[PDB]
Structures are given as structure tokens and as C-alpha cells.
Design a binder for this molecule. Structure first.
Ligand SMILES: Nc1ncnc2c1ncn2[C@@H]1O[C@H](CSCC[C@H](N)C(=O)O)[C@@H](O)[C@H]1O
Ligand SMILES: Nc1ncnc2c1ncn2[C@@H]1O[C@H](CSCC[C@H](N)C(=O)O)[C@@H](O)[C@H]1O
Lengths: 225, 227
């Protein structure tokens, strides 16, 4: 199958089952990463190198005043990637108890989290002209093709000048594959690039994550604006 | 050959129980502690348990009630919080580790106000009140009882069931025999042994189901619904 419309039988249930699944996940790094908490550092260190080139290389350098963490969970990325690099961070996640745990997990530096938004991305509108970086990691599989394109268009309008959107997520070898366990899909590169294009975004950089276990989906980062 | 009963693998019953009590006393009161480092599989487990259980809550001549459940070996209340409290008006918990029951008060949150009794007792010494529970949930703790104590506990659970009540066992199953884990001081039994014990307790199987989507390296997990 080549689209979510071909693999999702019931859209209302696709979303309701996903919300149920994460409501039942322990609010921990290993819970966020499906038992691969031990590779969080490998992930974060690679993301930081990917991101830092946009924050330090001009002309038209990306700014560091505010970032948005989408599907942020308990704040694994907010804690170790975003808060050290941005003066303020907003978080949005559908699971309220993860945002509650984030207040504890993030500690003293979490005081610089400006907004905690409890909302599904498909229902979320980031404020216009607000974010230098919008980070979307391991959650795009929870939106339909159409809702993903529409959300990315809203994100584009929330970027400050020189801002970027970063997508980091699992990529399927071919087609669009439904995971009936957590109620998410995985898409191949051509599908994702097509959705990015439909949202009016340009691809600035693309990089495959190295040093991951051989058994898991390949992971790619895309920088967009 | 393969061993067929705990009386072939347990050298000293008093020490089998005392070692287990000491082991759990030093486990963190967290979902990852409850699940032996596999905390991330909790939602897979809860979704399967709910689908398994809801079959028996359907309207009909044998419909299981929703007034009260008992969570056996409940730990901090992972199952009470995610599975049982949403479906039953009240829930009782029983566990040998006091500080898990203390932590439960925090872990369960506002809905924890509907937890009625917190029993701090080994299952082998616990006698639930007759005619009190619609569902008795026994998950990942049967390996901590001897064959004789498990059969007897199931007999006492049978007496505590309301009309149309059920007992659910969900636990690790060995491919063959009875295998001792001398770290946490528990056994893992094969399906034939477990079925033998269930039958000796005067219980019968309504349903039996293997748990899907688990990591390949761990013991297989089965659910049994009993009355
Ligand atoms: N429709 C949706 N909208 C917003 N968040 C969603 C969502 N569906 C699932 N989620 C959230 O997406 C997260 C996936 S786990 C990944 C967590 C985080 N991005 C990290 O890398 O550490 C969970 O926190 C879950 O609550
Ligand atoms: N003899 C015994 N009687 C009652 N509880 C016991 C016991 N031996 C061990 N336990 C308890 O059994 C639990 C095993 S961990 C499983 C916890 C819970 N059933 C869940 O699935 O989330 C621990 O909480 C431990 O304290």
C-alpha cells in the first residue's frame, strides 16, 4: 500500500487506539523509546550535530530564542537537545500524564518551558511567527497523510525568519505499513518527501541515522522550511 | 527428564519464600521494577488483557459483574490503575511488599480512592472473603507459590467469587517442565503442569490465550479464564 488511506480502515479508531496505547505507557525514557532507552544518547548526539549546523552557519542563521517539541512525551529531547540551545521551549503532546511527568523530569531547566500544550497534532495550531525550530520526532506515524500535510503547513506559518522544521522518524523500505500494536504507520522516503512537498516546504538537508541496531527501521532526519 | 512439580526443584520451602520476600524488598516501586526491566511492554499487556476480559463482561446468562475485583500480587497497582479501576466500581489489592502498597497510593492517583482494601500478605496466607469478587486477577506471581500453596490459594479464590465470577491467571509458561529462578526465587511451569494445578483446585477453563507481540527472548505468556 502507498498511502495511509489504503491501510487505515477506520480513521476515528486509528486516533483513539493510539491515544489509549500511550496513556498506558510508563512515563520514562525507555517507555518513550519502546525499550530502546539505551540508544537515547546516540540519537540525541546525532540530532545535536544535525541541528547545530543550522544554528551556527550563516548567512541567514537560524535563531535560538524559542523551539517547539512536537509529540514531546516526557521531554527526552526537550531536556538534552532543546533546552540547552534555546532560551525557551514549548511542548505539545496528546498524553497529559507525560506533560505532568515532564515538570519533574526536566528539573530546574524545565522552568524555561514556556507552554505545555496537551493536544493531538492533528488538532494543534502553533502560534504564527513564534519558533526558530520546530522538532517533530517519532510521531509523524500517528497522523494521516492529509493531517500530516496540513499540520506541516501550519508549522511553516509558525516559523520565525530563518526558522526550520526538523522531522526525525522511522522510514519504511517501501510503501506504508500499519503497526496495529501502537496504531501508527511507517512510510517510505518517497511518500514522506511527497507529503513535505504538498505542505509547501523545501528540503534543506536529509541524513540517515547511523549506529542503530540492525533490527529496527531506518531513521532519517529532514530539515525543512 | 523434565521436572513435573515444585517438590522436585525447591530445596527448602521456608527459604524459597524468604528469599523472594527479600528480593522484592530491594526492587524500585516503579512499572519497570514490576516488569523486570520490560516496563515498556505494559501497554501491549494491558490492551490484550482488556480484550481478553471484556468477552466475559458481555450481557448474557453468564455475564461477569463489575462491582469488585481483586488484584493479586498487585505491586504498585499497574494493572489496578490501567485495567481494573476503569471497569470495576471497587478494587482490592494484595501484595507481600509493603512499600509497593504505600507507593500505590501515589501511583494510582485520584482513581485510587476506589481501591478499598490494601492487603499486605503472602498469597499463601491470604483467604479472600467469600462471595466478594466478580474478577480475581492473578498476574506474574503464580511462580512464587509452591504447587500445594497455589492449588490451595485457587481453591480459596474459588470460594470468594460472586455468581458468574471468574479467576484470570496471566503468567509465564515454560516450554517443558518446572524451572527454578534462584535470583528472584520463583518457578516457571509448563502448560501441562499449570493445567494440572488448575484442575486439582476444582476449576475449569473458559478460555486460554497466548500473549502476542512480546520480545522473542522472554518466556511465553498465557492467559487463562477460570471458574
Ligand atoms: N496525535 C498525536 N499528537 C501528539 N502527540 C502524539 C499523538 N499520538 C501520539 N503522540 C505522542 O507521541 C509520542 C511518541 S514516543 C516519542 C516521544 C518523543 N518524541 C521522543 O523522541 O522522546 C508519545 O509521547 C505520545 O504521547
Ligand atoms: N508470595 C507472594 N504473595 C503475594 N505477593 C507476592 C508474593 N511473592 C511476590 N509477590 C509480589 O508479586 C509481584 C510480582 S511483579 C508483578 C506485579 C503486577 N502483578 C503487575 O503485573 O504489574 C511483586 O509486587 C511482589 O511483591
Amino acid at each position: 500500500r502507498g498511502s495511509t488511506s489504503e491501510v487505515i480502515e477506520d480513521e476515528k479508531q486509528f486516533y483513539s487506539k493510539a491515544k489509549t496505547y500511550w496513556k498506558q505507557i510508563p512515563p520514562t525514557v525507555d517507555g518513550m523509546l519502546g525499550g530502546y532507552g539505551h540508544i537515547s544518547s546516540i540519537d540525541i548526539n546525532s540530532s545535536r550535530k544535525f541541528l547545530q549546523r543550522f544554528l551556527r552557519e550563516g548567512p541567514n542563521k537560524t535563531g535560538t530564542s524559542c523551539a517547539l517539541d512536537c509529540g514531546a512525551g516526557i521531554g527526552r529531547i526537550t531536556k538534552r537537545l532543546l533546552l540547552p540551545l534555546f532560551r525557551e521551549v514549548d511542548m505539545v503532546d496528546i498524553t497529559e500524564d507525560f506533560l505532568v511527568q515532564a515538570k519533574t523530569y526536566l528539573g530546574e531547566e524545565g522552568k524555561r518551558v514556556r507552554n505545555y500544550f496537551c493536544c493531538g497534532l492533528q488538532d494543534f495550531t502553533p502560534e504564527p511567527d513564534s519558533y526558530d525550530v520546530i522538532w517533530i520526532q517519532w510521531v509523524i506515524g500517528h497522523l494521516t497523510d492529509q493531517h500530516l500535510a496540513e499540520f506541516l503547513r501550519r508549522c511553516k506559518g509558525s516559523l520565525r525568519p530563518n526558522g526550520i522544521i526538523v522531522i526525525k522518524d522511522n522510514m519504511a523500505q517501501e510503501g506504508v505499513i500499519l503497526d496495529d500494536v501502537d496504531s501508527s504507520v511507517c512510510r517510505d522516503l518517497d511518500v514522506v518527501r511527497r507529503i513535505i512537498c504538498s505542505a509547501g516546504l523545501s528540503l534543506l538537508a536529509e541524513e540517515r541515522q547511523e549506529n542503530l541496531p540492525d533490527e529496527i527501521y531506518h531513521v532519517y532526519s529532514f530539515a525543512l522550511r
